[PDB]
Write a protein that binds this ligand. Sequence first.
Ligand SMILES: [Zn+2]
Lengths: 53, 150, 303
Amino acid sequence: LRAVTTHDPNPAASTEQPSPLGREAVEQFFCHVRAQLNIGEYVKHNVTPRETV
Amino acid sequence: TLRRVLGLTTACVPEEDALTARGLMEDACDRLILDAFNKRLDAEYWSVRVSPFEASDPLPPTAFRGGALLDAEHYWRRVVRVCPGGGESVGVPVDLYPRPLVLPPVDCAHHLREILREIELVFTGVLAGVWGEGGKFVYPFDDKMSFLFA
Amino acid sequence: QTPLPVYRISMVPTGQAFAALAWDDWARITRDARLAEAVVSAEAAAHPDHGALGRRLTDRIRAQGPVMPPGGLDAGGQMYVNRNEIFNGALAITNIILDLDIALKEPVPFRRLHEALGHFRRGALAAVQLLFPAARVDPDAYPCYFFKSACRPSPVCSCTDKIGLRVCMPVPAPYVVHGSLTMRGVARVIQQAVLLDRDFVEAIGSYVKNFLLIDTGVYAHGHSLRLPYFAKIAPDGPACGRLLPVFVIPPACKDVPAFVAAHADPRRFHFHAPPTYLASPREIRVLHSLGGDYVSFFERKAS
Ligand SMILES: [Zn+2]
């Protein structure tokens, strides 16, 4: 709401700014969820194997 | 291990030498623990000596049925440690029973930890003296090779 | 010669018995559910496909295999009717054993079930290959053994509401698995991999009520799992649900008779059965840990 607030009636001189809503949500939450539903990423992220030779 | 570590010193190399030395100490500990696995069934090999001036585990009642074997106990007592069930780790006087012995698996983890404490006591001192380090030498027994005797 | 198998047996009408067996007569157990070599050779020669061959071998087994008559009230004659192997936590694990419980809202045909199993096997091998990097797991010729429980009063399957299956596959060489948590992690990874597959859901998603297939709680010290070729003791008076093999032939199987005869080997459905190597293991990599718990992203972030 702070990003979409204006301070000038003139459309050319409006003080609207791009909204930082989709970017933060897709970068902080949805990327991990996408990595969760792929088998290679799931194995890479969720298990830490330990082997002794 | 000390011979090899102090022989690497004549290479006139900076702190990287200390990292190499730490690697060799860890390798030596690994090899010692691996070679201790083939003697997991030996009860005399792991038994420790106890003098009358140290605290020790109470004698099991069966040890009083040895007979003539109780006569040769002037000074020392050899005690081994076994695991009867789930995390019990009781003590057994080795020399008070007739041979051969039929015992549960030996508690090699406990004895190996006791030995590794003394191993680290000298390795840490060597590292802190030769190169002037400040990091204690610790071997991750629990997360590396504790599964062998579990 | 220890170690020995230790079995828990359900006694009728109430009570439990225990056995510790140095050796047993597995030939008697598997005699009435074995295909002759001539029969499998003729069927393989007639049909060069693999799905049809597996369906017809299952048909031939189902129309032949009898059941054990009601055993005696003694524990020495009941272990041939019911028998469950007890998970020993002091031994290594050389077999991935999965307990599949399918809950249904509508009965499912057998031709659909065979395709569902064939697609399950494709994802299980991918999961195994991801879990064991130093091994070679060919997803076309690796052996995977399937057993299905018999129904309650191309083969026909009249299943009321549930389906019971056992999937047994060897741990790829030169790997071994130790501990109880590691097997739970392996089972969870395999279940996730087979759920993320596409063909399996298209094959079985319509009849399935919930997609929680594999039970990961069967790996614990003292926990018992029923063995194949043994009937489950029904609550009232009979024994039912005998686990008999379902032949899902690998697409690149070279010796079909060997694959068929490997279903009756008692070493292929035991947790700690000795590995089947060729000459000698030059080295073995024991995979002794995979993690502490699941605590998936959603729960951690909510916390
Ligand atoms: Zn059925």
